[PDB]
Amino acid sequence: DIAGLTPCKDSKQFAKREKQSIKKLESSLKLYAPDSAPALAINATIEKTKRRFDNYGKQGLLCGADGLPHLIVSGDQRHWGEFITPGILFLYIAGWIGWVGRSYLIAIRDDKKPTQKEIIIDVPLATGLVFRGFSWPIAAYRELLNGELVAKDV
């Protein structure tokens, strides 16, 4: 496929890793009784291993010669779930955190002792501001156009 890689559903090394991993867990399983609690734990880990390998091969992950999923972050639309889509999700969360904390610092900057509300959190004020990050890309963008995001001459 891309960069000489082969999809994990086609790679033999990928399937050999799944085999050897499951057979290694089965080798640990023979030591215990079929009704034992370690047996149900190892069986659950085996089922969890099958689920993991199957999910990786199903969602179009590319594999190298090592049989391990390689990620393609160039922006190719076949693999946006590998970086761009989770990255946009992160930037939404990160902007939320920064915008809410910024709203908090602005609200307490006019207090008599602003340091008091920085080492002892005003939870009521925080709880009222935590949901402004939901619309942070909008409130930030408007503050960009209105000259409210950046302090003048610093």
Partner 1 sequence: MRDLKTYLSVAPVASTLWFAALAGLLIEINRFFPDALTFPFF
Partner 2 sequence: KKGEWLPGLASPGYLTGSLPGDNGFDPLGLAEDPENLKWFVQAELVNGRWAMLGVAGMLLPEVFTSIGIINVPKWYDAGKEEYFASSSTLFVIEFILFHYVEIRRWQDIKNPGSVNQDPIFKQYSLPAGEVGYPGGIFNPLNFAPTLEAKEKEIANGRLAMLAFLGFIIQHNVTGKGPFDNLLQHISDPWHNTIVQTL
Ligand X SMILES: CCCCCCCCCCCCCCCCCC(=O)OC[C@H](CO[C@@H]1O[C@H](CO)[C@H](O)[C@H](O)[C@H]1O)OC(=O)CCCCCCCCCCCCCCCCC
Q: Out of 26, 47, 76, 111, which residue is the one contacting ligand X (CB under 6 A)?
A: 76
Q: Which residues between 89 and 148 bind partner 2 (CB under 8 A)?
A: 131-132, 134-135, 138-139, 142, 146, 148
The CA distances from residue 97 to 56, 86, 135, 151, in Å, are 31, 17, 12, 20
Tell me whether strands 62-63 and 6-7 are parallel, antiparallel or unpaired. Answer: antiparallel
Q: What's the distance, CA 85 to chain centroid?
A: 10
77 assigned ligand-binding residue: yes
127 binds ligand DGD (CB under 6 A): yes
Shortest distance, position 109 Cβ to partner 2, whole Å: 17
Of ligand X, ligand DGD, partner 2, none, which one sits near residue 124, judging by CB under 5 to 8 A according to partner kind?
ligand DGD
Provide the token pair at 48: 């969890």
Burial class (CB in 10 A: 0-12, 13-18, 19+), 14: buried
Q: Out of 69, 129, 133, 136, which residue is the one contacting ligand DGD (CB under 6 A)?
A: 129
d(CA 133, CA 99): 6
28 assigned ligand-binding residue: no
Shortest distance, position 27 Cβ to partner 1, whole Å: 22
State the residues that interact with ligand X by CB under 6 A.
Answer: 76-78
Binding residues for chlorophyll a: 74, 77
